[PDB]
Amino acid sequence: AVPFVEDWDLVQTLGGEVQLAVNRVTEEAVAVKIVDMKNIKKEICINKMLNHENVVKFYGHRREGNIQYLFLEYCSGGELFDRIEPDIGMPEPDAQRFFHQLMAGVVYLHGIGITHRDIKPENLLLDERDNLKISDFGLATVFRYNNRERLLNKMCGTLPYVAPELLKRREFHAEPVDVWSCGIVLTAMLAGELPWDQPSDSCQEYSDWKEKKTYLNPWKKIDSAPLALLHKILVENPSARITIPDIKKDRWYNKPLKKGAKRPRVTS
Ligand SMILES: CCn1c(=O)c2c(C)n[nH]c2c2ccccc21
């Protein structure tokens, strides 16, 4: 009915490319991922299955020849990456809250049989109230279908975030890989640095971690409570690695640290 409601002005480059689009009539904002098909099909397919408060909402897609347009939730708070101060990290209570939200999103995805495969701060966006949303399902895949798990073998992800089994084994379970990358994200949040270029014994920093030399860099900056959680996540053997239901029982995970968003108040 309302004449111009389907018109969106592309106002600014967010990061093919991602454009911030604003509705001509309502002024509602959305992100438009523009992909020059000249993976997308899978990405759209996967997005249509998604509906969760810690996952970037998918509004739809439009053809237009060789260009694919994916309409996605706009996250005005930007990337989590930008909230991490180099060599420092961020306040522990903030890191805990983002970690809780990240686990909520991951539990949701795993519950529907989807693995993201590329969790890292660049792919974790923040809304207007600093709620974290998992983004970019370009590398995502179905690991469970009709209640049967399929083992993965494709090497996907980003080296500093990738689990060591993906470098050492032909096949591996999907879920522990996403848990591992969440561990590296937690490290980045608390220390403002990545612990190693990749989880290989040829990597001095990685061997040092396996030898428990936590008086070294990023580890010494942590705090014993979140560090004990990291000791459970960053375990080389994915079969021994902590699972999400057990992360949710962790002492640090459950430690009261952060006050809720401060609301207006006065005194009489
Ligand atoms: C360029 C990376 N990027 C996105 O991909 C995206 C999406 C999708 N929604 N909101 C954003 C977004 C918002 C602020 C800054 C970067 C962003």
UniProtKB/Swiss-Prot annotation:
ATP binds at residue 33. The modification Phosphoserine is found at residue 268. Its EC number is 2.7.11.1. It catalyses: L-seryl-[protein] + ATP = O-phospho-L-seryl-[protein] + ADP + H(+); L-threonyl-[protein] + ATP = O-phospho-L-threonyl-[protein] + ADP + H(+). Residues 8-253 form the Protein kinase domain. There is a cross-link at residue 120 (Glycyl lysine isopeptide (Lys-Gly) (interchain with G-Cter in ubiquitin)). Residues 1-253 are annotated as: Interaction with CLSPN. One of its GO terms (biological process) is cellular response to mechanical stimulus. It is an enzyme of class 2 (transferase). It comes from the Eukaryota. The keyword Manganese does not apply. The active site is at residue 118. Phosphorylated by ATR in a RAD17-dependent manner in response to ultraviolet irradiation and inhibition of DNA replication. Phosphorylated by ATM in response to ionizing irradiation. Keywords: ATP-binding, Cell cycle, Chromosome, Cytoplasm, Cytoskeleton, Disease variant, DNA damage, DNA repair, Isopeptide bond, Kinase, Nucleotide-binding, Nucleus, Phosphoprotein, Serine/threonine-protein kinase, Transferase, Ubl conjugation. GO terms for cellular component: centrosome; chromatin; condensed nuclear chromosome; cytoplasm; cytosol; extracellular space; intracellular membrane-bounded organelle; nucleoplasm. Expressed ubiquitously with the most abundant expression in thymus, testis, small intestine and colon. Activated through phosphorylation predominantly by ATR but also by ATM in response to DNA damage or inhibition of DNA replication. Activation is modulated by several mediators including CLSPN, BRCA1 and FEM1B. Proteolytic cleavage at the C-terminus by SPRTN during normal DNA replication activates the protein kinase activity. Its main location: nucleus. GO terms for molecular function: ATP binding; histone H3T11 kinase activity; protein domain specific binding; protein kinase activity; protein serine kinase activity; protein serine/threonine kinase activity. Interacts (phosphorylated by ATR) with RAD51. Interacts with and phosphorylates CLSPN, an adapter protein that regulates the ATR-dependent phosphorylation of CHEK1. Interacts with BRCA1. Interacts with and phosphorylates CDC25A, CDC25B and CDC25C. Interacts with FBXO6, which regulates CHEK1. Interacts with PPM1D, which regulates CHEK1 through dephosphorylation. Interacts with TIMELESS; DNA damage-dependent. Interacts with FEM1B; activates CHEK1 in response to stress. Interacts with TLK1. Interacts with XPO1 and YWHAZ. Interacts with CDK5RAP3; antagonizes CHEK1. Belongs to the protein kinase superfamily. CAMK Ser/Thr protein kinase family. NIM1 subfamily. It is linked to Oocyte/zygote/embryo maturation arrest 21: An autosomal dominant, female infertility disorder characterized by zygote development arrest due to failure of pronuclei fusion. The autoinhibitory region (AIR) inhibits the activity of the kinase domain. Serine/threonine-protein kinase which is required for checkpoint-mediated cell cycle arrest and activation of DNA repair in response to the presence of DNA damage or unreplicated DNA. May also negatively regulate cell cycle progression during unperturbed cell cycles. This regulation is achieved by a number of mechanisms that together help to preserve the integrity of the genome. Recognizes the substrate consensus sequence [R-X-X-S/T]. Binds to and phosphorylates CDC25A, CDC25B and CDC25C. This is Serine/threonine-protein kinase Chk1. The chain holds residues 2 to 280 of 476 of the full protein.
